[PDB]
Design a protein around this ligand. Structure first.
Ligand SMILES: Nc1ncnc2c1ncn2[C@@H]1O[C@H](C[C@@H](N)CC[C@H](N)C(=O)O)[C@@H](O)[C@H]1O
Ligand SMILES: [Zn+2]
Ligand SMILES: [Zn+2]
Ligand SMILES: [Zn+2]
Length: 425
């Protein structure tokens, strides 16, 4: 093990390097203690492997769980067995993701075989911040508790049917500040899970580690050189957020004030907020709907909304503005999913310099973005350009993804195809 739990001065438990670490070094890997497909991806991706398919087969008993294959259906049965009847009874209604997630967790906790996901830190070690919650938040938790009790009612009727140390209210509180959003290879949000060992990592806006998902599986890597004893951190948040926005989310969701170098010095805020507030505020507001559509894989609607914004703001709002940038990114992704590849490259190319600015060093989201643009270029026959970007994507993803991630093999195949096309030209 290259990492260990320790007690920090002022931020609870954390994780630290046992040995010197190099960029790209694998620190930990884990399957989830428990996970579920997220609200917007339900029925779009396989329940088990979280990969999207034109044809998924519904579970016969609930008609809610969907799978890409008989293999996935079977492997998922232990996790699905006790929720099947609960999902069935409430159809077409469907519980919040956290409720479905904790529904799985409670039966997992009764397995006598230790979960690998809990090697460093267990579900019960998870921070709940109970003494820090606002009254409005505690009220929302009590609403969640009631929803769980009703959702689970065919399987569980009383507290005596779960481990004594398990407390439903504190379990929802643990979920708020220890959940991971599982992303597919293209960085679309597809699931949510608990990975208790990985929950040990404290947050920074300039982290020395990063996580990536390959299906439900999580890989933790160093993303720069790290010294013996140094605290290991990850960034909890989207990079395309101002310091005021990050501070709000970290306060509201994680019960802390971020005092990192970036937050203290408003690092990159001026570039993020390029252009006129009266113009970009309208983009920010429009993104609420655009992001929700994207989360539900509604690509035609996303594209329509983004095109309206991109065309109307072209004379006034620069692409480096984070709101304009998010709209370009959504537009690109909508186009890729609809097979509008020339248009996708048009939007993706415009994201390149801002991504270089806002995702410094080695960040998996930038590696994936560069790979997407490289692949589009190769498709469009722009071989020298594609080759530079595919190599750049490799320079990044070798660190952020590593050779244990299946996307690296995919990338190598594109570079070989591009190379062959160059030699043939
Ligand atoms: N940069 C930070 N400054 C202060 N508290 C932090 C920071 N990052 C994480 N935390 C705390 O850690 C919680 C989330 C946990 N996943 C991390 C490990 C946690 N410190 C523990 O003892 O279990 C947050 O909700 C905060 O309570
Ligand atoms: Zn599957
Ligand atoms: Zn079922
Ligand atoms: Zn910060």
């Amino acid at each position: 093990l290259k990492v260990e739990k320790f007690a920090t001065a002022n931020r609870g438990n954390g994780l630290r390097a046992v040995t010197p670490l190099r960029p790209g070094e694998l620190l930990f890997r884990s399957d989830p203690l428990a996970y579920t497909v997220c609200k917007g991806s339900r029925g779009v991706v396989c329940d088990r492997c979280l990969l999207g398919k034109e044809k998924l087969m519904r579970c016969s008993q609930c008609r809610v769980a969907k799978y890409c294959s008989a293999k996935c259906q079977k492997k998922a049965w232990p996790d699905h067995k006790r929720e099947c009847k609960c999902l069935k009874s409430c159809k077409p209604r469907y519980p919040p993701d956290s409720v479905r997630l904790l529904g799985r967790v409670v039966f997992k906790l009764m397995d006598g075989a230790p979960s690998e996901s809990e090697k460093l830190y267990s579900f019960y070690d998870l921070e709940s911040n109970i003494n820090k919650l606002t009254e409005d938040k505690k009220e929302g938790l009590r609403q969640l508790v009631m929803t769980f009790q009703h959702f689970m009612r065919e399987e569980i009727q009383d507290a005596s049917q779960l481990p004594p140390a398990f407390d439903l209210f504190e379990a929802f509180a643990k979920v708020i500040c220890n959940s991971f959003t599982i992303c597919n290879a293209e960085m679309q949000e597809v699931g949510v899970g608990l990975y208790p060992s990985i929950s040990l990592l404290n947050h920074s806006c300039d982290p020395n580690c990063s996580i990536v998902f390959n299906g439900p599986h999580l890989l933790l890597r160093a993303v720069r050189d790290i010294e013996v004893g140094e605290e290991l951190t990850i960034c909890y948040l989207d990079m395309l957020m101002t310091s005021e926005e990050r501070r709000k989310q970290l306060r509201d969701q994680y019960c802390f004030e971020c005092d990192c170098f970036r937050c203290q010095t408003q690092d990159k805020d001026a570039d993020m907020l390029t252009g006129d507030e009266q113009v970009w505020k309208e983009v920010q507001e429009s993104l609420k709907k655009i992001e929700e559509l994207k989360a539900h894989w509604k690509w035609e609607q996303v594209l329509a909304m983004c095109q309206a914004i991109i065309s109307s703001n072209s004379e006034r709002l620069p692409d480096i503005n984070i709101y304009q940038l998010k709209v370009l990114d959504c537009a690109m992704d909508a186009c890729i999913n609809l097979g509008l590849l020339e248009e996708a490259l048009f939007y993706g190319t415009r994201t390149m310099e801002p991504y270089r600015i806002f995702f410094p060093g080695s960040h998996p989201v930038r590696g994936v973005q560069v790979m997407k643009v490289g692949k589009l270029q190769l498709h469009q026959g722009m071989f020298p350009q594609a080759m530079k970007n595919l190599r750049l994507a490799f320079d990044i993803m070798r660190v952020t993804h590593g050779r244990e991630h299946s996307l690296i093999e995919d990338l190598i195949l594109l570079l070989e195809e591009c190379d062959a096309n160059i030699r043939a030209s």
